[PDB]
Every structure is written in structure tokens, then in C-alpha cells.
Amino acid sequence: MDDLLGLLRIRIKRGVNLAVRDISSSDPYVVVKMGKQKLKTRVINKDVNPEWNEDLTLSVTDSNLTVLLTVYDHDMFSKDDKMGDAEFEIKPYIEALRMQLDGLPSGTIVTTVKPSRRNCLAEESRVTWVDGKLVQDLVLRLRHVECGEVEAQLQWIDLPGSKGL
Ligand SMILES: [Ca+2]
Ligand SMILES: [Ca+2]
């Protein structure tokens, strides 16, 4: 609690045109890693366009951290094949959370992160103040695989008793 800024909600929305790692399909799930934390979504059966809509919750004590996202094909009785990976920075979002935004009109775009050679963004990622919440919408193009994107949204949970932002 004495280092905790808050909890980062990562909503893993969907995968789009993921790689085939069975015969004609895959059984994808996502593993999210940050620091010593490792979280997993459920498996979606036989769908390379899986709609996970699954909330993962990480503890954040460090605005300078990176989130790693790796997709795998679940094979019940054998090894799980890699289906690509991506990473993103949380600093822009944490920075934005620390701004004065009570008073900003809903729909206000606080920060835009551009795709670059180094990052995994498939398109510009907006940090938006909307419906009284700050969110970041991400489309991640997966590395180290022949196709696939993962769409995710960042949200924030304040934990009373913590260090806070
Ligand atoms: Ca397989
Ligand atoms: Ca499989």
C-alpha cells in the first residue's frame, strides 16, 4: 500500500485476425505481465477473432512500467504455441491521471500517442476524459507473428489507503 499508486484495469476487448496454430483455427488466450505480476484471460475456443471482453487488474507502484501482452493457442493435450506479443507504456496514462481534469468537457482528448517503429500501436492511441472517467483505447499489432491485433482499454481504480497518484 505504501508504494501503490492505484490499480490499472486492462480490459482485453478482442483479438482480430489472430494466427492459426491448429489446423484451421486457434484457441486463444492472453497472458499479461508487468513486473512480477502475471495475469491470464480465459481461452476462447476455435476463434481467431475472439471477443474476450475480460478485465484484468494490476497493481501499479511505478509509472515507468511497461505491460507485456502475449497471445497463445491453448492445446489441451500438448504444448501451447505462441501467437505473437506486444507491449505498451503506461506512463502517458498515469501522467494524464495526474492532470486536473475535473472540469474538462466529456469527450476531451488529453493525450494522443502515435504509432512508431519502436512501439506496438496499430493506430494513434487516445487518452480520453469521458463520462467522468479517464480511459485509454489501444489497438496493438502483434509482433513475431504473421498476423493479428489485440484491442484493449485502460481504466483506473483508486484504492483508499494507498500512496495514490
Ligand atoms: Ca495448436
Ligand atoms: Ca489449440
Cross-strand partners of 159 = none
Residue 111 contacts residue 95 (beta carbons within 8 Å): yes
**Which of 133, 151, 154 is closest to 142 using CA atoms?**
151
- Ligand closest to 74 (CA) is 2
Q: Ligand 1 centre from 20 Cα, in Å?
A: 8
Using the Cα atoms of residue 14, residue 18, residue 22 and residue 25 in order, give the sign of their dihedral: positive
* Sheet bearing 66-73, strands edge to edge: 37-40, 28-34, 66-73, 81-89
- Sign of CA pseudo-dihedral 74, 80, 81, 82: positive
Greatest pairwise CA separation for the chain in angstroms:
55
> Quick one: which of 9, 46, 13, 8 has its CA closest to 30?
13
Asked whether residue 2 is marked as a ligand-binding residue, the answer is no
- Measured from the alpha carbon of residue 45, the closest ligand is 2
Q: How far apart are CA 80 and CA 25, in angstroms?
A: 13
**Non-local CB neighbours of 106 within 8 Å, separated by 6+ positions:** 129, 130, 131, 132
Q: How far is the CA of 57 from the centre of ligand 2 (A)?
A: 26
Query: How far, in Å, CA of 6 to CA of 163, rounded?
Result: 8
Annotate 48-87 with three-state secondary structure.
CCCCCCEEEEEEECCCCCEEEEEEEECCCCCCCEEEEEEE
- Is residue 144 part of an annotated ligand binding site? no
The alpha carbon of residue 106 and the mean position of all alpha carbons in its chain are separated, in whole angstroms, by 23
What is the radius of gyration, based on Cα positions, of the chain?
Answer: 17
Are the C-beta atoms of 75 and 107 separated by less than 8 Å? no
User: Which residue carries 478485465 as its cell?
Assistant: 55
For residues 34 and 71, the answer to whether their CB atoms sit within 8 Å is no
Burial 103-120 (b: 16+ CB within 10 A, else e): ebeeeeebeebeeeeebb
Beta bridge partners of 26: none
What kind of experiment solved this structure? X-ray
Tell me the H-state helices in the chain.
Answer: 91-97
Å from CA of 74 to ligand 1 middle: 7
Answer yes or no: are the C-beta atoms of 77 and 91 closer than 8 Å.
no
Which residues, in sequence order, are bridge partners of residue 9? 57, 155
Resolution in A: 1.6
**Residue 92 in contact with residue 112, Cβ under 8 Å?**
no
